[PDB]
Design a protein around this ligand. Structure first.
Ligand SMILES: *C(=C)Cn1c(=O)c2cnc(Nc3ccc(N4CCN(C)CC4)cc3)nc2n1-c1cccc(C(C)(C)O)n1
Length: 260
């Protein structure tokens, strides 16, 4: 008479911590595949809006499956702790690949910055076409499979477009339009964060947290990357961080662009 998670899964290793929980690679005993399962470090719960778990729960019931969104399977409770079961991306974070890149002197090259952004753009389009918005796009929440395809994860900041409940994501990928509580075009904030996400993958410095370097970036000023790229590509990238607001390309207008 043990827990659903004990009886159903075999816990292989702990693989990360986030959204107020711990994630473990787990083999499901009955089908023998691998899943990433996040166990809430806290109990149900707090007040809404700024509540991760309700954002995750709402997003997982609105969205279906898409090849570039990390697939959701099941979610349940244990001793008042929430447990989320998602597909297991075996290549880890995109952030982790950039680090092992950076320490080893290498850097993602323009043919790969392009494919990183195209595939994420496809996944971002499915979210927005479901009238949802991610609100925490960064290499931490992009996952690699067969390691090749990138998928978006962490929906602790996700929300409906129509009646939004907004908790701003990571500040280093945060569009100033969101910081000033202008939710007139929320999907464009993921576009903005994606533009910076691709900047991190090209090899840019660790992004600024606040101050003038922050304020400099949100004036359309792309962060410095020790790398030269096509100014046809480089123009598209700065149209993604451009200041305010509806001008930035839609995830569909990005999933069509022959530059990519
Ligand atoms: C929600 C449950 C968040 N989430 C996912 O849905 C998935 C899916 N797939 C992964 N894959 C993954 C595999 C392996 C690693 N590591 C390998 C071992 N090294 C030493 C560290 C990295 C990482 C990721 N992960 C998923 N997560 C997930 C995993 C870890 C942290 C997070 C947070 C911080 C909540 O986003 N999410």
């Amino acid at each position: 008479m043990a827990s659903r998670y004990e009886k159903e899964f075999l816990e292989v290793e702990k693989i990360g911590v986030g959204e107020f929980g711990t994630v473990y690679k787990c083999i499901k005993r009955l089908d023998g595949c691998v899943y990433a399962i996040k166990r809430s470090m806290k109990t149900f719960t707090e007040l809404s809006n700024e509540n991760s778990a309700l954002h995750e729960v709402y997003a997982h019931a609105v969205l279906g499956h898409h090849p570039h969104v990390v697939r959701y399977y099941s979610s349940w409770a244990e001793d008042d702790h929430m447990i989320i079961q998602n597909e297991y991306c075996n290549g880890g974070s995109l952030q982790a690949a950039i680090s092992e890149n950076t320490k080893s002197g290498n850097h993602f090259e323009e043919p790969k910055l392009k494919d990183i952004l195209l595939q994420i753009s496809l996944g971002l389009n499915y979210i927005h076409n479901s009238s949802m918005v991610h609100l925490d796009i960064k290499p931490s929440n992009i996952f690699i499979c067969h390691k090749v395809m990138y998928k978006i994860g962490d929906l602790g900041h996700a929300t409906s477009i129509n009646k939004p409940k907004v908790e701003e994501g990571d500040s280093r990928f945060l569009a100033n339009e969101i910081l000033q509580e202008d939710y007139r075009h929320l999907p464009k904030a993921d576009i903005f964060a994606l533009g910076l996400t691709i900047a991190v993958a090209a090899g840019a410095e660790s992004l600024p947290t606040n101050g003038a370097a922050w304020h400099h970036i949100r004036k359309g000023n792309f962060p410095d990357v020790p790398q030269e790229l096509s100014e046809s590509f480089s123009s598209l990238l700065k149209n993604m961080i451009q200041p305010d607001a509806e001008q930035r390309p839609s995830a569909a207008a990005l999933a069509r662009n022959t530059v990519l």
